[PDB]
Design a protein around this ligand. Sequence first.
Ligand code: A1IIW
Ligand code: A1IIW
Ligand code: CA
Ligand code: CA
Ligand code: CA
Ligand code: CA
Ligand code: CA
Ligand code: CA
Ligand code: CL
Ligand code: CL
Lengths: 128, 128
Amino acid sequence: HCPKDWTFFQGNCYFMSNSQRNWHDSVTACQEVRAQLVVIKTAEEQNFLQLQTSRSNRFSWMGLSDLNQEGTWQWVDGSPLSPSFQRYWNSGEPNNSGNEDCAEFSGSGWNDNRCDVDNYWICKKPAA
Amino acid sequence: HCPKDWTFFQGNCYFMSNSQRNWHDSVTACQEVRAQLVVIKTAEEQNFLQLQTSRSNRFSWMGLSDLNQEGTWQWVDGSPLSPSFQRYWNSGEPNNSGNEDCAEFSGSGWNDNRCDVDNYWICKKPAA
Ligand SMILES: OC[C@H]1O[C@H](OCCCl)[C@@H](n2cc(CN=C3NCCN3)nn2)[C@@H](O)[C@@H]1O
Ligand SMILES: OC[C@H]1O[C@H](OCCCl)[C@@H](n2cc(CN=C3NCCN3)nn2)[C@@H](O)[C@@H]1O
Ligand SMILES: [Ca+2]
Ligand SMILES: [Ca+2]
Ligand SMILES: [Ca+2]
Ligand SMILES: [Ca+2]
Ligand SMILES: [Ca+2]
Ligand SMILES: [Ca+2]
Ligand SMILES: [Cl-]
Ligand SMILES: [Cl-]
């Protein structure tokens, strides 16, 4: 199914880092291994990731930013965060407190955080 | 079937500017017409635009910057510049010479340039 250190879930493989980096450097680390800082396509996928991050008690980068235009959120695959999936924001988020343009998993939902924060991160590539 | 003043190429509509503007202004100019400073998704698309600029010998903006993090380039739709498409930098580039954070068509490939420079620009939007 997937490489070692990677986890299969519904057709894709997921790598949970063992180190921390800013968002930009996390984007590239995923590219280094033919993967992408995770883009969420389905409810179940979010659910799964939300829980996996909660279990290890970690904040983790996903591939979602409003770096280009404040308030218009974008997947790293160049798609808009759809109205539907805006529901995954933690309450009161995204709040852009002191310019926060990179999404992290923060307990049960998403938080916009400073891009220069060192977080864990998640790569996704297909099982195939 | 694009609107008048737009050029159709493989599903999309491209607007090649007569006027020169700086990068940020070029981003807004494209938004104003329901489009986006050009994000290059395929190799063919790259070729068409490379041709279209080079035949006039003009520099032109595309929707790509490393403003938010030196060395980690990102398209204006959210997508990071992939390792594969890094092949399109002219040789020696990006050099970030006296700081350069926006990307332009520059002959046969791409050059990083100061964002305040007035350059032509290209919009893109779906033809439906
Ligand atoms: O939780 C509410 C707000 O708390 C902090 O801001 C306080 C002033 Cl409003 C920020 N914040 C949250 C976090 C949690 N994430 C991490 N990652 C590394 C350690 N903490 N950090 N700052 C911010 O993103 C958030 O909207
Ligand atoms: O060696 C080519 C380098 O030439 C200039 O730097 C000189 C000192 Cl290193 C820069 N440069 C090139 C250009 C051409 N682009 C335009 N746009 C409108 C007119 N010039 N501009 N700066 C730079 O981007 C480039 O890497
Ligand atoms: Ca911002
Ligand atoms: Ca923001
Ligand atoms: Ca926040
Ligand atoms: Ca810079
Ligand atoms: Ca730069
Ligand atoms: Ca340059
Ligand atoms: Cl024009
Ligand atoms: Cl020119």
